[PDB]
Design brief:
Two copies of one chain form a homodimer. The first copy, chain A, is an alpha/beta fold. Chain A contains eleven helices and eight strands. In chain A, strands 7-6-5-4-3-2-1-8 form an eight-stranded parallel β-sheet. The interface of A and B includes residues 12, 43, 46, 47 and 65 of A. Chains A, B: It is an enzyme of class 5 (isomerase).
Amino acid sequence: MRHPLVMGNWKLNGSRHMVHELVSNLRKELAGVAGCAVAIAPPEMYIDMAKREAEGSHIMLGAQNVDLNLSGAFTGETSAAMLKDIGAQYIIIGHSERRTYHKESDELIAKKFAVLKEQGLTPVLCIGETEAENEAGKTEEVCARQIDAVLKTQGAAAFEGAVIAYEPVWAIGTGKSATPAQAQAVHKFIRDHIAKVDANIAEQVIIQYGGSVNASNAAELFAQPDIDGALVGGASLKADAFAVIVKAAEAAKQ
Amino acid sequence: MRHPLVMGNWKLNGSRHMVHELVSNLRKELAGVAGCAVAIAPPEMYIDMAKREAEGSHIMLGAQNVDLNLSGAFTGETSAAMLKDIGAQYIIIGHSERRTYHKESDELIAKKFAVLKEQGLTPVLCIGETEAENEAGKTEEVCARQIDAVLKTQGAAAFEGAVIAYEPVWAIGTGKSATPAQAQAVHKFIRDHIAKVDANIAEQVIIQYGGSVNASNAAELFAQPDIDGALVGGASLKADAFAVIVKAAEAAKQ
């Protein structure tokens, strides 16, 4: 029932030249793709440009973060109202890089979620456990805590039209691997957790895998019933590699 | 000897419609200005649009913040390389709103200053004391410390072509305001502080007043010898008001 979504998180990579080349190449590589939705999140200053270059394609826009205010005396902040105005749809919040580097709390990320829903934007809520948490067997505990920050304060209806990306931080560039079976176990837990509150809402949430995915990984991952796509890091900077993942998602969901 | 600079810090205010209207109005209101440089800092997502709207005018672009990395796996950050690529020149760092709301340290801001210099961008270094600091008589100690973060790590040569903006934070929302005499005493102190290290650099640094500046009070402030312009808040959102401030600077320094 769930239409897959593959989203490219460019992280801190981009330039006028790069945006033109990558978006152009993405359109070409994604020709004929109909069975998987596609979004990209360039650095904020390139969203407008990327949106322009994406005309004629099915590539949707997004962003890498948002702050809490819509307007006012908040020098250097990002407004959900302005993201909407410039045409970004899918807004990444709570990425592990921000939770760690910028000490973003569960409570803060939940507030970001609320402002996005209020504006009618799509949160891509990133959740996931550390090396120590995984080793301690606290995967489920951590994921539930990070989800509950929204679910307990905003209700199950907050997740209508929302996306969750599970990041196995313990497995990302660490020497440790996470299997499709292991990913499916977590995705299943996440959906079940929401279902305890509202089964209908749980059934429609898009749960993306945010761990390492490549051409060797994609088909086995996307065959899993509770994995609805992928939030892609480094591979999103190469049109061919990114399109391989998109096409694998399309093929797996048939 | 110093050519004034009036810069508009739009803060968290903007939309595509607003950018078009405001920049168009700015172009018209400022078309006959010769004796004052002008920069604007829209929200990050609108820099590209504003730069394109300003083409043909003397309105220079800027931004409200920058982070430390040029590229890499830093979701949601702002790159100095990208700010340059998109056409921003004048980069506000250490604004009181960011020192307070986002806990940015003196040391972090000095690091931002260094990254900007390496990219050939112009830092607009914001400094200023709080209500508690001002009441404790620590105006000079605080300004000196905030400047010293750069001065004692990068030398006076770092301030070549750079801009300082003094914000009396104690005057924000307190129902209080600095007189031109008070503002001038602080600007004179800042310049003398740099002159202790390099007198020639001190004489060429643009020191902007960053407290409340409007069409009404601009003339009296710009009559002061060590006030080289203004970092303007709310009045930067209305072209007519902003133009009065620019012209007052031109007239005062003519």
